[PDB]
Ligand binder design. Structure first.
Ligand SMILES: Nc1ncnc2c1ncn2[C@@H]1O[C@H](COP(=O)(O)OP(=O)(O)NP(=O)(O)O)[C@@H](O)[C@H]1O
Ligand SMILES: Nc1ncnc2c1ncn2[C@@H]1O[C@H](COP(=O)(O)OP(=O)(O)NP(=O)(O)O)[C@@H](O)[C@H]1O
Ligand SMILES: OC[C@H]1O[C@](O)(CO)[C@@H](O)[C@@H]1O
Ligand SMILES: OC[C@H]1O[C@](O)(CO)[C@@H](O)[C@@H]1O
Lengths: 296, 296
């Protein structure tokens, strides 16, 4: 089977579990603290690997002990690391994550460490014939548009059944990312992006943004407890309710779990309605568990 | 001049500066992140060194790069490290500190790493003749009571002007620490401890706890924006208003700055009223500055 490639950034999540959300200006004893490999596209590889899809991760890396921790972790999941881009400057970014044990909330303090991003030129080296699906985590959009253009160009020269399917995620409310709406077969837009653009529900977001996707695309917007919606070319609004666990313990990476699961379901040939439901079910199962392993 | 000894624990503060206090379940970009040597008694040594008092720090240490960072930092301040207790298990504890750039608040998530504490037996090795003042950060009280007993025993055999002056801090609302109230010439009790015991002001706390200190002792309770109070044997309540800076930027270690400053003022022979005022002034100056260096 051909692999699913994810392009994005691995992050070191340094996770502090507390029994309540820290009141400002207090001192609180943490229940525990752990390191966990993170990053959106990186977490999606974890879930795709767990679901049984061969996959490859492409991101920048800076050698060192943090590098070794996260790369060792990806290897444990049998994620193909062929296209790691080693950088000679900067370092693996760090996210300081507070998990409220009472609600499973996650609050993320993020700190850029100036690691250079994967470039269009880096991407030119990928052997596209190896992949049946390529997922791109939106970050340095002007370069990513070039990567997406290279995939399109490849696709024109292939039969309908050998075309690489493409998804993109637009998760941060940053202007430069919106151009990515117009690329890919599947476009994931976050609730945060939606709300930043003045939309109040997944349905408003989809109706209000659909005109920006490429002809034939499916636009997907997950909305936490309210489930997830999608809108395709036929104009039909699709929805799944959320499937919460009996007790929500850890929502760090729930959206990434949703994304990977939708990608997997669609790549298996399932309908958008089915993918939305599967996505919500796996994400909801993940929320009732620490980390990712117990989803299967 | 004889030194001032502080017994306590060095902590690595990993500090994230943000422009607002993180809303639960959000993602926020940090303005910056830095390492800073911390720990109560450890921060007090920093300030005493800056004020021009020769001092020594005694705490547990676990070799490694964190150790090297904090020990190198203490050496920069010319703090005597003769009595470092090297441990072969556990590691230097880590405090994850969120500083709200808008208010200077500090919110501390603390994570024990099972480093063994300094013991009464460790303390027996100290050459008491070297010190004119010994400050003890309240932690493992049953052992610390033994250290305090050894200092008392030493003192009985010395002239009034060669007696070592002693202070203790009771900062955490933990039962085992309250026994320490009955030791030392100067007893610092925190606002947090006071409020945990049902007191609503520094004055209520002092009137309500004075019966627990040893005959002749001065009990001190700092109350942030409301200044600091003290109560000695003569029954007179003493007070200084706070001296806030024009802009409060960083209150991490303000209490430790207050403690060190009161200790310094008293060790120089100043009155309790003067020490309280000096303590409030140096602390307030420290609050308008990142870290400690600019206080002098
Ligand atoms: N609290 C919850 N209860 C039940 N299901 C949830 C909950 N939160 C999220 N989900 C499911 O996860 C899907 C994706 O959640 P999303 O709103 O994308 O969270 P996220 O902030 O992107 N997670 P993270 O990857 O850490 O950023 C939602 O559509 C739900 O189906
Ligand atoms: N916001 C403030 N404005 C002005 N002065 C302050 C302020 N906060 C503290 N101070 C001064 O610092 C003294 C000690 O503050 P305290 O209430 O002990 O804070 P703290 O929580 O122990 N600091 P830290 O060492 O990080 O735990 C107070 O008595 C004041 O004199
Ligand atoms: O992108 C930074 C952060 O977002 C996440 O990927 C969650 O989706 C975290 O794992 C990572 O630390
Ligand atoms: O004791 C743990 C924490 O308390 C402080 O000493 C402040 O008084 C911090 O510097 C340290 O990280």
């Amino acid at each position: 089977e051909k692999q699913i490639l994810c392009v994005g950034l691995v992050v070191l999540d340094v996770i502090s579990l507390v029994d309540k959300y820290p009141k400002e200006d207090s001192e609180i004893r943490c229940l525990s603290q752990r390191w966990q490999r993170g990053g959106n596209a990186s977490n999606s590889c974890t879930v795709l690997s767990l679901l049984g899809a061969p996959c490859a991760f492409m991101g920048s890396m800076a050698p060192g002990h943090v590098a070794d921790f996260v790369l060792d972790d990806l290897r444990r999941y049998s994620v193909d690391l062929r296209y790691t881009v080693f950088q000679t400057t900067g370092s693996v970014p760090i996210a300081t994550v507070i998990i409220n044990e009472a609600s499973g909330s996650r609050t993320i303090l993020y700190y850029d460490r100036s690691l250079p991003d994967v470039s269009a030129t880096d991407f030119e080296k990928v052997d596209l014939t190896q992949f049946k699906w390529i997922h791109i985590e939106g970050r340095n959009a002007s370069e990513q548009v070039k990567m997406l253009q290279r995939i399109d160009a490849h696709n024109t020269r292939q039969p309908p059944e050998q075309k690489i399917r493409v998804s993109v995620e637009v998760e941060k409310p940053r202007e430069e990312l919106f151009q990515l709406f117009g690329y890919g077969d599947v476009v994931f837009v976050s609730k945060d992006v939606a709300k930043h653009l003045g939309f109040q529900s997944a349905e408003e977001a989809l109706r209000g943004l659909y005109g920006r996707v490429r002809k034939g695309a499916v636009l997907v917007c997950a909305w936490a407890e309210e489930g997830a919606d999608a809108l395709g070319p036929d104009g039909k609004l699709l929805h799944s309710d959320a499937f919460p666990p009996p007790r929500v313990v850890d929502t760090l990476g729930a959206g990434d779990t949703f994304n990977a699961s939708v990608i997997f379901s669609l790549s298996q040939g399932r309908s958008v309605q089915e993918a939305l439901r599967f996505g919500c079910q796996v994400a909801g199962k993940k929320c009732g568990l620490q980390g990712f392993d117990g989803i299967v």
